[PDB]
Structures are given as structure tokens and as C-alpha cells.
Enzyme design. Structure first.
Site, PDB file in Angstrom:
ATOM      1  N   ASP A 173       0.788  -1.244   0.000  1.00 52.04           N
ATOM      2  CA  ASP A 173       0.000   0.000   0.000  1.00 52.04           C
ATOM      3  C   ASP A 173       0.819   1.293   0.000  1.00 52.04           C
ATOM      4  OD1 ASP A 173      -2.401  -1.544   0.203  1.00 52.04           O
ATOM      5  OD2 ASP A 173      -2.047  -1.742   2.355  1.00 52.04           O
ATOM      6  N   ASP A 188       2.631 -17.638  14.133  1.00 52.00           N
ATOM      7  CA  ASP A 188       2.477 -17.539  15.591  1.00 52.00           C
ATOM      8  C   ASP A 188       1.060 -17.945  16.020  1.00 52.00           C
ATOM      9  OD1 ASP A 188       0.850 -15.220  15.130  1.00 52.00           O
ATOM     10  OD2 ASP A 188       2.609 -13.910  15.296  1.00 52.00           O
ATOM     11  N   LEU A 231      -8.843  -7.404  13.833  1.00 47.35           N
ATOM     12  CA  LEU A 231      -7.446  -7.314  14.242  1.00 47.35           C
ATOM     13  C   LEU A 231      -6.599  -6.617  13.171  1.00 47.35           C
ATOM     14  CD1 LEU A 231      -5.104  -8.079  16.165  1.00 47.35           C
ATOM     15  CD2 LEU A 231      -5.236 -10.384  15.199  1.00 47.35           C
ATOM     16  N   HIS A 276       1.567   2.596  18.639  1.00 41.10           N
ATOM     17  CA  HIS A 276       0.864   1.753  19.601  1.00 41.10           C
ATOM     18  C   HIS A 276       1.530   0.378  19.746  1.00 41.10           C
ATOM     19  CE1 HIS A 276      -2.881   0.269  21.665  1.00 41.10           C
ATOM     20  NE2 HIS A 276      -2.439  -0.876  21.176  1.00 41.10           N
ATOM     21  N   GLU A 277       1.863  -0.235  18.614  1.00 46.84           N
ATOM     22  CA  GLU A 277       2.521  -1.541  18.620  1.00 46.84           C
ATOM     23  C   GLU A 277       3.869  -1.511  19.337  1.00 46.84           C
ATOM     24  OE1 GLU A 277       0.936  -4.198  17.942  1.00 46.84           O
ATOM     25  OE2 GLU A 277      -0.755  -2.943  17.305  1.00 46.84           O
ATOM     26  N   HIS A 324       3.774  -1.833  22.946  1.00 46.65           N
ATOM     27  CA  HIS A 324       3.747  -3.243  23.371  1.00 46.65           C
ATOM     28  C   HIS A 324       5.135  -3.869  23.329  1.00 46.65           C
ATOM     29  CE1 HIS A 324      -0.519  -3.334  23.779  1.00 46.65           C
ATOM     30  NE2 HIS A 324      -0.791  -3.291  22.488  1.00 46.65           N
ATOM     31  N   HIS A 364      -2.348  -2.257  27.800  1.00 46.41           N
ATOM     32  CA  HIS A 364      -3.344  -1.236  27.471  1.00 46.41           C
ATOM     33  C   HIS A 364      -3.672  -0.303  28.640  1.00 46.41           C
ATOM     34  CE1 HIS A 364      -4.573  -4.024  23.972  1.00 46.41           C
ATOM     35  NE2 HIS A 364      -3.829  -3.042  23.504  1.00 46.41           N
TER      36      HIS A 364
HETATM   37  C1  AZ6 Z   1      -5.442  -6.764  20.049  1.00 48.71           C
HETATM   38  C2  AZ6 Z   1      -5.160  -5.449  19.347  1.00 48.71           C
HETATM   39  C3  AZ6 Z   1      -6.313  -5.066  18.443  1.00 48.71           C
HETATM   40  S1  AZ6 Z   1      -5.965  -3.879  17.162  1.00 48.71           S
HETATM   41  O1  AZ6 Z   1      -5.009  -4.462  16.242  1.00 48.71           O
HETATM   42  O2  AZ6 Z   1      -7.281  -3.508  16.683  1.00 48.71           O
HETATM   43  N1  AZ6 Z   1      -5.271  -2.539  17.980  1.00 48.71           N
HETATM   44  C4  AZ6 Z   1      -3.980  -1.997  17.457  1.00 48.71           C
HETATM   45  C5  AZ6 Z   1      -3.995  -0.505  17.186  1.00 48.71           C
HETATM   46  N2  AZ6 Z   1      -4.727   0.137  18.256  1.00 48.71           N
HETATM   47  C6  AZ6 Z   1      -4.479   1.516  18.418  1.00 48.71           C
HETATM   48  N3  AZ6 Z   1      -3.590   2.114  17.608  1.00 48.71           N
HETATM   49  C7  AZ6 Z   1      -3.383   3.418  17.803  1.00 48.71           C
HETATM   50  C8  AZ6 Z   1      -4.020   4.147  18.776  1.00 48.71           C
HETATM   51  O3  AZ6 Z   1      -3.738   5.507  18.911  1.00 48.71           O
HETATM   52  C9  AZ6 Z   1      -4.748   6.142  19.686  1.00 48.71           C
HETATM   53  C10 AZ6 Z   1      -4.473   7.608  19.653  1.00 48.71           C
HETATM   54  C11 AZ6 Z   1      -4.117   8.292  20.799  1.00 48.71           C
HETATM   55  C12 AZ6 Z   1      -3.864   9.645  20.748  1.00 48.71           C
HETATM   56  C13 AZ6 Z   1      -3.970  10.326  19.553  1.00 48.71           C
HETATM   57  C14 AZ6 Z   1      -4.325   9.638  18.411  1.00 48.71           C
HETATM   58  C15 AZ6 Z   1      -4.442  10.312  17.168  1.00 48.71           C
HETATM   59  N4  AZ6 Z   1      -4.548  10.893  16.170  1.00 48.71           N
HETATM   60  C16 AZ6 Z   1      -4.575   8.287  18.459  1.00 48.71           C
HETATM   61  C17 AZ6 Z   1      -4.906   3.455  19.562  1.00 48.71           C
HETATM   62  N5  AZ6 Z   1      -5.150   2.148  19.397  1.00 48.71           N
HETATM   63  C18 AZ6 Z   1      -6.124  -0.234  18.329  1.00 48.71           C
HETATM   64  C19 AZ6 Z   1      -6.141  -1.662  18.818  1.00 48.71           C
HETATM   65  N6  AZ6 Z   1      -3.869  -5.419  18.736  1.00 48.71           N
HETATM   66  C20 AZ6 Z   1      -3.008  -4.651  19.468  1.00 48.71           C
HETATM   67  O4  AZ6 Z   1      -1.800  -4.571  19.293  1.00 48.71           O
HETATM   68  N7  AZ6 Z   1      -3.695  -4.009  20.414  1.00 48.71           N
HETATM   69  C21 AZ6 Z   1      -4.960  -4.405  20.405  1.00 48.71           C
HETATM   70  O5  AZ6 Z   1      -5.855  -3.990  21.132  1.00 48.71           O
HETATM   71 CA    CA Z   2      -7.651  -7.698  10.057  1.00 48.63          CA
HETATM   72 NA    NA Z   3      -2.787  -4.155   2.498  1.00 52.96          NA
HETATM   73 ZN    ZN Z   4       1.810 -12.380  14.375  1.00 50.42          ZN
HETATM   74 ZN    ZN Z   5      -2.695  -2.866  21.777  1.00 51.87          ZN
END
Ligand code: AZ6
Ligand code: CA
Ligand code: NA
Ligand code: ZN
Ligand code: ZN
Ligand code: AZ6
Ligand code: CA
Ligand code: CA
Ligand code: CA
Ligand code: NA
Ligand code: ZN
Ligand code: ZN
Lengths: 165, 166
Positions: free
Chosen positions: A25, A71, A81, A119-120, A123, A129
Site C-alpha cells: 500500500d 504464531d 485485528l 501503539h505496537e 507493546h 493497554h
Molecule cells: C489486540 C489489538 C487489536 S488492534 O489491532 O485492533 N489494535 C492496534 C492498534 N490500536 C491503536 N492504535 C493506535 C491508537 O492511537 C490512539 C491515539 C491516541 C492519541 C492520539 C491519536 C491520534 N490521532 C490516536 C490506539 N489504538 C487499536 C487496537 N492489537 C493490538 O496490538 N492491540 C490491540 O488492542
Molecule cells: Ca484484520
Molecule cells: Na494491504
Molecule cells: Zn503475528
Molecule cells: Zn494494543
């Protein structure tokens, strides 16, 4: 002697990452820019340093994959997901996998790779979270970014602030 | 925020273990004797007690495997990685996996199972590696050739720093 650390974290401040493969992409450059920015979110508020490896074994191995990709956490096609990452540790520890049945973007369209990667990497570095609805680690995607305070407090609890100015 | 919390020690003194399967290299009796002795090293100098379960779930699940064997920490054939164990905690926590591409022995022809197991269970109980070159938890396998094993003081001090003395 040594007992195991109190929390799951990297015992070293110098961490490597490798982009194992790339999404259809976005250009290689766009993907590289997004991950560099996402790592900088965390290195800016800690003493952590991040260096990219082109080949070989890095601490944080990044890859794009679909469905079963090696995995216990198979992806599920479009939406649902989006990605996942493992806590600090050997082998798959620290690694980040992105679902390439999602549309990844450098913009507001699809899912912003930078934001999801930031976010990743939370982790990968040892954060789970947050219940703070403004937090980067609040597990709901929304779209000049500034790492929210809850996330700063969390990461500094593990690694300290590093240089504060 | 939340971090990934790490159980630093078992919150109970009475722990269970299960020998899920057995190496080709030693008799069942030899394997049971090696693990029992390996647990005794740690229970002798703490209040910890170990009970063997034959069926079902136990705190410390013991198994032999090769290559990829169910946790995505694959073994690597003969030599190199000999075994691994998980720190204290639920599920995989405490468990010990031994690479059955190694030759396991009651004596010296291969890797002494008792010795490696005692090291592994150190990990299962919450001990990381020591920098003391004589320590059981120093990460290089050696064999004294002596019929008696005496837990080095460094390991005693380490395990006692979590659970106290017996
Ligand atoms: C299991 C899962 C599900 S997932 O794959 O669906 N998951 C990934 C990504 N995640 C997310 N990413 C970015 C975010 O930033 C929020 C934010 C804060 C401030 C400003 C702005 C702005 N502008 C944004 C929030 N949440 C949502 C949950 N996978 C994982 O790694 N965690 C999980 O919960
Ligand atoms: Ca998916
Ligand atoms: Na893609
Ligand atoms: Zn994986
Ligand atoms: Zn997460
Ligand atoms: C990652 C790895 C690699 S591993 O699988 O290669 N590993 C396991 C076993 N380990 C070991 N085992 C027994 C030892 O006893 C030393 C000793 C002291 C005093 C007297 C006598 C006597 N007689 C022996 C020492 N080190 C070496 C490292 N796996 C893991 O669990 N830790 C790890 O480092
Ligand atoms: Ca890794
Ligand atoms: Ca267990
Ligand atoms: Ca091996
Ligand atoms: Na064997
Ligand atoms: Zn294993
Ligand atoms: Zn070890």
C-alpha cells in the site's frame, strides 16, 4: 546471583529493528518514515535508542502478513485485528506484525501506519493497554502528534526519562 | 497505563510438577529420579515443597521436545540450546522444556539431566543467571565427576532472597 527483573522490559537501551518485508500500500520510503517516527515517539521521552538493521537478527522484527503467518495470533482479513506485537523478550519478543489485509496509509485514509506502529511499539517495549481514553495505548484506533501523558508516565516507569531537555 | 506484570516469586510454598513425557535416553525411573533430585536442591534450602502429579495441570509442567514444540521458542537439534524454562506465573510460567535432540544421561555421556534440570528449575522459581562462575545459575554446563552435588552458596543466597531459608 540475579533474580528476574520486576517488570518485563529490555535490559539494554540500544535496540535494533528490522523491516523484514513491506506492504503493497505504501512505498518503502513511506513505511520507513512511519516506523522511524513511531520509534522516535518513545526514544524522545526515554533513554532508548533505535537503530535499523537491513538484514539479520534485530530485537524488534517487523513484518506484514495475512491470516496464519507463524504464531498463535492469526490475522482475520480486512478490519477486526489490525496488528499485534509481543512484549520484550527473546525471539518473537518485541516483534511487531501488521495485517496486510488492512489498507495502510501515511494519511487519514485506511489505517495510519505510523499511529498503529507507535501503539505496537508501546507493546514491544513493555506497555499493555491503558484505561485513559486519550492514551496511545488505549486499545481503540483513532486518527503534529504528541505522545499523551499516560503513555509518557507508563514508558518512563520502565525506562526512566533519559535526557529531560 | 499498564505494564506487563512479572510474578517475581511463587506466592505459595507448595508447588506441583508433572512429567508429561520422557526422553528415549534414560529409563522412566532414571528420569523421575533426576527431576526429584533437581527439585530437592531448592527445597532443601527453602520452605518450598514439590509434589509430583501424574495427570492434569501442574504448576511446573515438564516435557521433552525437539525443534518447534508448541511455544515458538524452537529447539535447534544437537548442542546449542539444551533446554529452557519460564519464570514463575500461571500457564506456561514455571514450565521446563528439554531438547530431546540432546543426549540425556544419569552420568556423564552427554548432558547430565539432573544438573541441567536443577538449573532450569532455578529459572522456574524466579532466578536469572548469576555472574558467579561457580554458580549453578552461571550459564555454562560443567560436570564435576563427583557423585555428590552441593548447591553453591551464590545460588543458596539467590533462592533464599526470594523464599527465605528452610
Ligand atoms: C489486540 C489489538 C487489536 S488492534 O489491532 O485492533 N489494535 C492496534 C492498534 N490500536 C491503536 N492504535 C493506535 C491508537 O492511537 C490512539 C491515539 C491516541 C492519541 C492520539 C491519536 C491520534 N490521532 C490516536 C490506539 N489504538 C487499536 C487496537 N492489537 C493490538 O496490538 N492491540 C490491540 O488492542
Ligand atoms: Ca484484520
Ligand atoms: Na494491504
Ligand atoms: Zn503475528
Ligand atoms: Zn494494543
Ligand atoms: C538459554 C539457555 C541455554 S542452555 O540450554 O545452553 N543452558 C541450560 C543449562 N545451563 C547450565 N546447566 C547447568 C549448570 O550447572 C553448572 C554447575 C555448577 C556447579 C556444579 C556443577 C556440576 N556438576 C554444575 C550450568 N549451566 C547452561 C546453559 N537455556 C537456559 O535455561 N539457560 C540458558 O542459558
Ligand atoms: Ca524479537
Ligand atoms: Ca505452569
Ligand atoms: Ca539443542
Ligand atoms: Na535425546
Ligand atoms: Zn519450549
Ligand atoms: Zn539458564
Amino acid at each position: 546471583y540475579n533474580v528476574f527483573p520486576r517488570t518485563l522490559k529490555w535490559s539494554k537501551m540500544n535496540l535494533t529493528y528490522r523491516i523484514v518485508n513491506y506492504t503493497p500500500d505504501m512505498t518503502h520510503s513511506e513505511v520507513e518514515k512511519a516506523f522511524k517516527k513511531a520509534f522516535k515517539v518513545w526514544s524522545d521521552v526515554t533513554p532508548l535508542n533505535f537503530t535499523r538493521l537491513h538484514d539479520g537478527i534485530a530485537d524488534i522484527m517487523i513484518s506484514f502478513g495475512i491470516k496464519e503467518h507463524g504464531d498463535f495470533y492469526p490475522f482475520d482479513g480486512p478490519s477486526g485485528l489490525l496488528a499485534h506485537a509481543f512484549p520484550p523478550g527473546p525471539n518473537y519478543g518485541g516483534d511487531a506484525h501488521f495485517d496486510d489485509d488492512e489498507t495502510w496509509t501515511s494519511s487519514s485514509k485506511g489505517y495510519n501506519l505510523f499511529l498503529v506502529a507507535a501503539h505496537e511499539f508501546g507493546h514491544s517495549l513493555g506497555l499493555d493497554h491503558s484505561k485513559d481514553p486519550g492514551a496511545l495505548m488505549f486499545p481503540i484506533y483513532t486518527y503534529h502528534f504528541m505522545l499523551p501523558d499516560d503513555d509518557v508516565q507508563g514508558i518512563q516507569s520502565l525506562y526512566g526519562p533519559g535526557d529531560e531537555d
